[PDB]
Amino acid sequence: MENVKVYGVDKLKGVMGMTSGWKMPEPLEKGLLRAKNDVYVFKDGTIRFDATDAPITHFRPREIGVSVEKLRELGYTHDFEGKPLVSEDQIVELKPQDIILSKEAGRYLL
Amino acid sequence: LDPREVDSEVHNMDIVRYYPLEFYEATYELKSPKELVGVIERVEDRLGKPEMYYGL
Amino acid sequence: PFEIVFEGAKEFAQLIETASRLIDEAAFKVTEEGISMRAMDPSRVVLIDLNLPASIFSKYEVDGEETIGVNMDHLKKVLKRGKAKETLILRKGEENFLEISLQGTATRTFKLPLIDVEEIEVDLPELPFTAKVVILGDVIKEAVKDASLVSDSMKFIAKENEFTMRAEGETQEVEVKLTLEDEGLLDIEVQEETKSAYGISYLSDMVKGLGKADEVTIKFGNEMPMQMEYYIRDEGRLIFLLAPRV
Amino acid sequence: FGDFVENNQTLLPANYCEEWWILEFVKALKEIYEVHLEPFTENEEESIEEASDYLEIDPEFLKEMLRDPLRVKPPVELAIHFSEVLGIPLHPYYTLYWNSVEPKDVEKLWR
Amino acid sequence: ELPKEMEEYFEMLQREIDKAYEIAKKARAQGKDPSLDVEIPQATDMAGRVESLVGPPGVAKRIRELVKEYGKEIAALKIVDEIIEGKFGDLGSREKYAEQAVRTALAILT
Numbered sequence: 001m002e003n004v005k006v007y008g009v010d011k012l013k014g015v016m017g018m019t020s021g022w023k024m025p026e027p028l029e030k031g032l033l034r035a036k037n038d039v040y041v042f043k044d045g046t047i048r049f050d051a052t053d054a055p056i057t058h059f060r061p062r063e064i065g066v067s068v069e070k071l072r073e074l075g076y077t078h079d080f081e082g083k084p085l086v087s088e089d090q091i092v093e094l095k096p097q098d099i100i101l102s103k104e105a106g107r108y109l110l
Numbered sequence: 111l112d113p114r115e116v117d118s119e120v121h122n123m124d125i126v127r128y129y130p131l132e133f134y135e136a137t138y139e140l141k142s143p144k145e146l147v148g149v150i151e152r153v154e155d156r157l158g159k160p161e162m163y164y165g166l
Numbered sequence: 167p168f169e170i171v172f173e174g175a176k177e178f179a180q181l182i183e184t185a186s187r188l189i190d191e192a193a194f195k196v197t198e199e200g201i202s203m204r205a206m207d208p209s210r211v212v213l214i215d216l217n218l219p220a221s222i223f224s225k226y227e228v229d230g231e232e233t234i235g236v237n238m239d240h241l242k243k244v245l246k247r248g249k250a251k252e253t254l255i256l257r258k259g260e261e262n263f264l265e266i267s268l269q270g271t272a273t274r275t276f277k278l279p280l281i282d283v284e285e286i287e288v289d290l291p292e293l294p295f296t297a298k299v300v301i302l303g304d305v306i307k308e309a310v311k312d313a314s315l316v317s318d319s320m321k322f323i324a325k326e327n328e329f330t331m332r333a334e335g336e337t338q339e340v341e342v343k344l345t346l347e348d349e350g351l352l353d354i355e356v357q358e359e360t361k362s363a364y365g366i367s368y369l370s371d372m373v374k375g376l377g378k379a380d381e382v383t384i385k386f387g388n389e390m391p392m393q394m395e396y397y398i399r400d401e402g403r404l405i406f407l408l409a410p411r412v
Numbered sequence: 413f414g415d416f417v418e419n420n421q422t423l424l425p426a427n428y429c430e431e432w433w434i435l436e437f438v439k440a441l442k443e444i445y446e447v448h449l450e451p452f453t454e455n456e457e458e459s460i461e462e463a464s465d466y467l468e469i470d471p472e473f474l475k476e477m478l479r480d481p482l483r484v485k486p487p488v489e490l491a492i493h494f495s496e497v498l499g500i501p502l503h504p505y506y507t508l509y510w511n512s513v514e515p516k517d518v519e520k521l522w523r
Numbered sequence: 524e525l526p527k528e529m530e531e532y533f534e535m536l537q538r539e540i541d542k543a544y545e546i547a548k549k550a551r552a553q554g555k556d557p558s559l560d561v562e563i564p565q566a567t568d569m570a571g572r573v574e575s576l577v578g579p580p581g582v583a584k585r586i587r588e589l590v591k592e593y594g595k596e597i598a599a600l601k602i603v604d605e606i607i608e609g610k611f612g613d614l615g616s617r618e619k620y621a622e623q624a625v626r627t628a629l630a631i632l633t
Contacts, residue, residue, distance in 0.1 A: 119418055122414035122415075122417045122418045123414040124413050124414050127452050128431055128435075128451065128452055129413070129431070131432075131435045131436075131439065133413075134426050134432050134435075137423045137424070137425055137426040138425055138426070140422060140423060140424075140425070141422070141423050142420070142422055143413065143417040143420070143421070143422075143423060144417070144420070147417070150413055152414060152417070
């Protein structure tokens with residue numbers, strides 16, 4: 001608490017025992033900061049979010065709530081028919097490693 | 111990302127804007143989908159060429 | 167090296183409990199003018215301001231000014247031990263310890279180490295308040311209780327010489343209205359029609375502990391934050407600033 | 413279709429829809445009047461004008477219906493006129509589930 | 524090979540990845556964690572993943588050449604033959620060779 005200057009935390013849950021062969025523990029400052037921000041931990045020391053997966057190849061800037069200027073900043077400059085991207089009702093093609101999150105996912109990732 | 115080494119079930123997905131008339135005329139004959147693999151373009155028909163990430 | 171004395175330790179304990187019901191860490195500023203405290207809840211929704219002038223305390227000897235921080239849980243637990251006719255003495259020596267002494271039949275002295283809490287100076291300036299309402303604690307407390315009983319949010323509608331509070335639920339409806347002629351509204355003034363909605367959990371936390379014979383000043387506008395205040399010993403002031411929904 | 417290919421499932425007969433109808437429409441147009449048009453794209457103005465003149469329709473309507481056959485439909489009288497002139501089945505939007513009833517029920521209803 | 528857009532896309536992705544990795548390395552260098560460096564290596568193709576997962580060291584180039592020449596299955600078979608004979612070092616008993624060959628071949632096919 002003196003290290004991370006976090007004093008007003010009511011609960012801090014741990015484990016009954018470690019499962020690895022090393023039994024190396026985690027710093028308690030990380031646990032305090034997790035308890036302060038209301039996030040949990042996994043078996044390997046990461047915070048994860050599970051969701052059902054669905055496919056998509058083309059999108060519209062109005063469905064995902066992003067301006068055309070922001071898209072042009074990201075790299076999208078045309079629509080799927082070769083025309084320049086100047087409207088929010090045009091259909092754009094998704095790049096292979098671009099994802100669209102839910103709003104629960106965004107709330108937790110905040 | 112390299113589509114050549116991701117999976118094998120995604121290599122059967124269609125990348126056509128519309129199906130041809132021959133597909134509809136062959137559905138009435140209760141054919142098997144393997145008989146018209148070349149008629150409708152799939153993902154497997156583009157592997158190797160640079161246009162795997164381009165024109166779906 | 168300051169020394170501060172108070173009469174009626176139960177009042178101070180209730181004040182501290184009301185202030186700490188929404189925050190977890192608080193930093194008190196001690197000066198020649200008085201003791202001040204200003205903090206925000208972890209959700210960054212409600213702003214709490216506490217002001218205690220030197221005229222309230224029986225004895226007030228401060229040479230300089232320094233800020234002290236202490237955990238709210240320990241302070242609340244210690245202060246709850248006081249009675250209604252005791253003398254509370256807060257002392258701080260050359261050491262970094264806070265001594266809390268209760269003077270009654272026997273003197274009990276507690277010690278609380280000081281904790282370094284980060285100071286973030288944020289303030290809310292004056293805002294144009296369309297409606298100003300002076301109300302009693304009982305009416306608002308039972309109104310919030312009924313609103314929590316039926317719904318999750320509370321709506322305040324103030325018009326000329328009228329004040330109503332509505333709670334819209336999925337199925338049930340609750341309406342509470344009172345006029346100037348009723349004893350609930352001591353004062354009222356309205357520049358123009360106003361309407362706003364606020365949460366109940368924050369309101370339930372703020373209004374809990376209010377007495378029956380207490381005057382509470384409520385000011386709010388159209389879709390802009392509501393300000394609640396009430397006075398202790400006619401000079402001490404507690405200020406609540408609650409942001410509206412949406 | 414890739415779902416059918418992956419699981420090796422025999423193709424089932426296809427229900428009549430707008431995408432089949434538009435292909436039949438353009439094929440009949442080319443076979444009769446020798447005009448080349450394609451759906452889901454943009455065509456030349458000359459071909460659009462020729463087709464509209466032969467069909468006695470508004471060129472803007474023809475452009476809109478060739479661009480988006482799944483959202484733009486002709487009125488029932490215009491569909492009947494198309495079926496009479498070009499010689500294609502009725503538009504699928506105005507076809508009822510005639511094969512969900514027996515011919516004797518239709519006999520009684522007709523009477 | 525690739526046009527002037529997908530290559531730029533991949534370059535910007537790599538740029539962002541590097542930007543994150545530098546901060547991760549600088550944070551980990553201070554010795555407040557079980558290790559003094561990041562514990563997630565980055566790969567680029569199947570051969571790198573196989574080398575990082577099961578090994579043996581130096582197999583990436585051989586896998587690349589064999590898949591370029593013959594194909595995936597024949598490349599796995601040639602890799603098995605090379606591991607058994609002793610291109611990739613001395614392991615010990617025949618049990619070690621069998622285990623390594625099975626693991627690497629299953630990784631290559633998989």
